[PDB]
Design a protein around this ligand. Structure first.
Ligand code: SF4
Ligand code: SF4
Ligand code: FCO
Ligand code: F3S
Ligand SMILES: [Mg+2]
Ligand code: NI
Ligand SMILES: [O]
Lengths: 530, 261
């Protein structure tokens, strides 16, 4: 028998999950993306300088990342070398995007699959505050905790539960095991993260103009000369520190604490094959000048990290709603939507299926962190150790749904640590009078270019083919297309489908075990299909 | 019960309209959700999933509610391009929208068609009033891509405190969309002085001259960007990028190529 979850909530976009259960365990799975917008079809024949504004709208959650991959793809296809300050400013804006993205995912998108908010009402606030105080250096008081409990009570007592209506933990659930006291610390932090996210977004807006959907980037560099002022760098620096502190003192600490009561998840939802293009370059034409490294892990072998080769990417359409069964490298991509209904001709998704050298891969924080760690990136290596050491598990615990979740915590902090470096430089350059943000450029007659971005959800690449300053071809291959796409022509399961197999389901009528797995991937259906 | 009920629908969108919402300040989203309204249906924040949430939408629509629609509605070839639950987006909206006390179209996509409606509009997407106008839906249009958090929340609270705001012919509340960005732009001094940037890396660009020659669509766009700011901190023109007319019908086609007047 089947279990269908539609809609999957607490994600971006329209996803439907259908699974086959057998002996209380997922035995087969299908990832169904149900909205198509067709951004690559709309781009056809337009001015490459407009691309960035259209592409950015593929998604407003991972806002900015597509503006960047687009300006990087047109920078590359026109051979322009942007100034150092535009490189630094583009990096700070991405750093701030990881800070924000990650924090919002953990608390508002994911926490609710592990936390029973209703149980918080049963916690002894003084006992919750003592524990909280043994977990981080930030002092918590009973009263602040008693206050959150009064909020929950005030809400429950009105009968209008809002977003808690029909929650899966209503009236208990066997898969929800934290003590009521951890449920209350986590609820107090969820409300707190709602206010921090506002500061993380504002910091991004200092360089980005606004959040969501930045408007400060161009092919050739950046436009924001205003933010090059000491006052505006000071401002950003203040918000940055408030947010950084919160990730180090509350997000990370809560992450390890909850993970600590769900150690059996360190053996659920395992995958092989990881890839990344790295992020934060010094040289915009060198994948190896990036802070976080690029590489390819095969199986689960961290001893041999290969070189990332984009020539090995092909996108399949055998099980998607597009004409025929051809797989194409992105420069030769085609987008001819052909609907055949749910499982019509066995096609079940609006997402194409990217395969690497014909194999299914996983992209994202886990993939990124495994490459960095295997390649011995100190920040990463110091951070992974902290975590394993804190959960008392080894690195083999990283290949799981639990690992997929701790890695996002790790990727969020390493990014956070480096923001200080770029700021500092940006600032020293401006003090020395070096203030350029833009480089002039001209179009070749005919050219092709690729933009590689390691978005919060993994490997993003925008591919362009231009002739006369007009787009001939514009293909996007998004991280969620990798993780959540259907099977390929060779019938291989995408990373989410494969992570599902084996998951145990307590109550099939309230199957949060599917959500825990699906959510660990941070799906973005708007991005995966565009 | 106590707080007024809101049912929030997600159609052909990018979800940047919902993240703009989370950015609201005075009131913060917590005050909004726990003290001002009752967020009964919202796919992005919900605890339950699958049928638990569809039973919730189903009972909420039996009452007195305001309907918030984010995203355009796909209508070509029957609208199968956009599905929630196996049901086409137009079917869900046709069912929900008409039972609401008021409908609010959030984002240029819900108001006018948006990004997926730019040429050649593969999916046949249209805005709310164009799709449901014949079912009697007359939505309040909060334009922008995305709109200022202030304009959406300030309209909900208005609606809840003072009543229906006066609209312009484009459906936008004149209290927020009554003047053009240009009329409040601080680079207006440069403009009036006949001082223009003709390139992004030039001394005039560095001096913050007017971006008109660089395609600023400010003189044609109705929005309150310059006076309200975004994130309480910046707006496109202040970050030296021209305005792309993101709050106007058909901007995607009408106002592109973006870097040319
Ligand atoms: S109006 Fe813009 S931000 Fe809002 S859903 Fe549409 S594309 Fe996204
Ligand atoms: S920058 Fe744009 S909005 Fe400002 S004065 Fe110039 S044309 Fe008008
Ligand atoms: N992060 C993000 Fe969005 C996805 N998947 C892209 O890029
Ligand atoms: S692009 Fe949109 S955000 Fe305001 S400055 Fe122009 S109307
Ligand atoms: Mg694509
Ligand atoms: Ni996204
Ligand atoms: O995303």
């Amino acid at each position: 028998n089947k279990i269908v979850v539609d809609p999957i909530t607490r994600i971006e976009g329209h996803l439907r999950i259908e699974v086959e259960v057998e002996g209380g365990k997922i035995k087969n799975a299908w990832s169904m993306s149900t909205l198509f917008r067709g951004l690559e079809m709309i781009l056809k024949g337009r001015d490459p300088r407009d691309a960035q504004h259209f592409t950015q709208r593929a998604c407003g959650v991972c806002t900015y990342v597509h503006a960047l991959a687009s300006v990087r793809a047109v920078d590359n296809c026109v051979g322009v070398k942007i100034p150092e300050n535009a490189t630094l400013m583009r990096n700070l804006t991405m750093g701030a995007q990881y800070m924000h993205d990650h924090l919002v995912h953990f608390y508002h998108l994911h926490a609710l699959d592990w936390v029973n908010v209703a149980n918080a009402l049963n916690a002894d606030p003084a006992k919750a505050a003592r524990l909280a105080n043994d977990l981080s250096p930030k002092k918590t008081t009973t009263e602040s905790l008693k206050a959150v409990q009064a909020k929950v009570k005030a809400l429950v007592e009105s009968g209008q539960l809002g977003i808690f209506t029909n929650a899966y933990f209503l009236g208990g659930h066997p898969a929800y095991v934290l003590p009521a006291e951890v449920d209350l610390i986590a609820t107090a932090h969820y409300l707190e993260a709602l206010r921090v996210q506002v500061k993380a977004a504002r910091a991004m807006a200092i360089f980005g103009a606004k959040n969501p959907h930045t408007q400060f980037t161009v092919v050739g560099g950046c436009t924001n000369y205003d933010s090059l002022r000491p006052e505006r760098i000071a401002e950003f620096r203040k918000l940055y520190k408030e947010v950084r502190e919160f990730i180090e003192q509350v997000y990370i600490t809560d992450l390890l604490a909850v993970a600590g009561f769900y150690k059996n998840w360190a053996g659920i939802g395992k995958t092989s094959n990881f890839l990344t293009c790295g992020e934060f370059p010094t040289d915009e034409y060198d994948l190896n000048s990036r802070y976080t490294p690029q590489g390819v892990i095969w199986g689960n072998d961290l001893s041999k990290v290969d070189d990332f080769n984009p020539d090995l990417i092909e996108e399949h359409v055998k099980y998607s709603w597009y004409e025929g069964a051809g797989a194409h490298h992105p420069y030769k991509g085609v987008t001819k939507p052909k609907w055949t209904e749910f499982h019509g001709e066995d096609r079940y998704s609006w997402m194409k299926a990217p395969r690497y050298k014909g194999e299914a891969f996983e992209v994202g924080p886990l993939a990124s962190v495994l490459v960095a760690y295997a390649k011995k990136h100190e920040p990463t290596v110091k951070a992974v150790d902290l975590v394993l050491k804190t959960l008392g598990v080894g690195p083999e615990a990283l290949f799981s749904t639990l690992g997929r979740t701790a890695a996002r915590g790790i990727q969020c902090l390493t990014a956070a640590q480096e923001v200080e470096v770029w700021l500092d430089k940006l600032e020293a350059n401006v003090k020395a009078g070096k203030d350029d943000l833009y480089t002039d450029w001209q179009y070749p007659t005919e050219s092709q270019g690729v933009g590689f971005v390691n978005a919060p959800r993994g490997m993003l690449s925008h591919w362009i083919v231009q002739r006369g300053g007009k787009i001939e071809n514009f293909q996007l291959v998004v991280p969620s297309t990798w993780n959540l796409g259907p099977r390929c022509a060779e019938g291989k399961l995408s990373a989410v489908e494969q992570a599902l197999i084996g998951t145990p389901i307590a109550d099939p009528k309230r199957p949060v075990e599917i959500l825990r797995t699906v959510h660990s991937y941070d799906p973005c259906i708007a991005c995966g299909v565009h | 019960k106590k707080r007024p009920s809101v049912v929030y629908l997600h159609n052909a969108e990018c979800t940047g309209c919902s993240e703009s919402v989370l950015r609201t300040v005075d009131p913060y989203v917590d005050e909004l959700i726990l003290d001002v309204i009752s967020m009964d249906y919202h796919e992005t924040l919900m605890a339950g999933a699958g049928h638990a949430v569809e039973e919730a939408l189903h009972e909420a629509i039996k009452g007195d509610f305001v309907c918030v629609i984010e995203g355009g509605i796909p209508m070509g070839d029957g609208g199968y391009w956009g599905k929630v639950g196996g049901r086409n987006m137009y079917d869900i909206c046709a069912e929900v929208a008409p039972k609401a006390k008021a409908v609010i179209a959030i984002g240029t996509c819900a108001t006018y068609g948006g990004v997926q409606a730019a040429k050649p509009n593969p999916t046949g997407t249209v805005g709310v009033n164009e799709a449901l106008g014949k079912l009697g839906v007359k939505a309040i249009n909060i334009a922008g891509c995305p709109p200022n958090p202030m304009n959406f929340v300030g309209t909900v609270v208005h609606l809840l405190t003072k009543g229906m705001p006066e609209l312009d012919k484009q459906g936008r509340p004149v209290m927020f969309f009554g003047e053009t960005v240009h009329d409040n732009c601080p680079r207006l001094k440069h403009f009036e002085a006949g001082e223009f940037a003709t390139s992004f890396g030039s001394p005039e660009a560095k001096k913050g001259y007017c971006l008109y020659e660089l395609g600023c669509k400010g003189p044609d766009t109705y929005n309150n960007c310059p006076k309200q700011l975004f994130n309480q901190v910046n707006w496109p023109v202040q970050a030296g990028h021209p305005c792309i007319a993101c709050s106007e019908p058909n901007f995607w086609d009408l106002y592109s190529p973006f870097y040319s007047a």
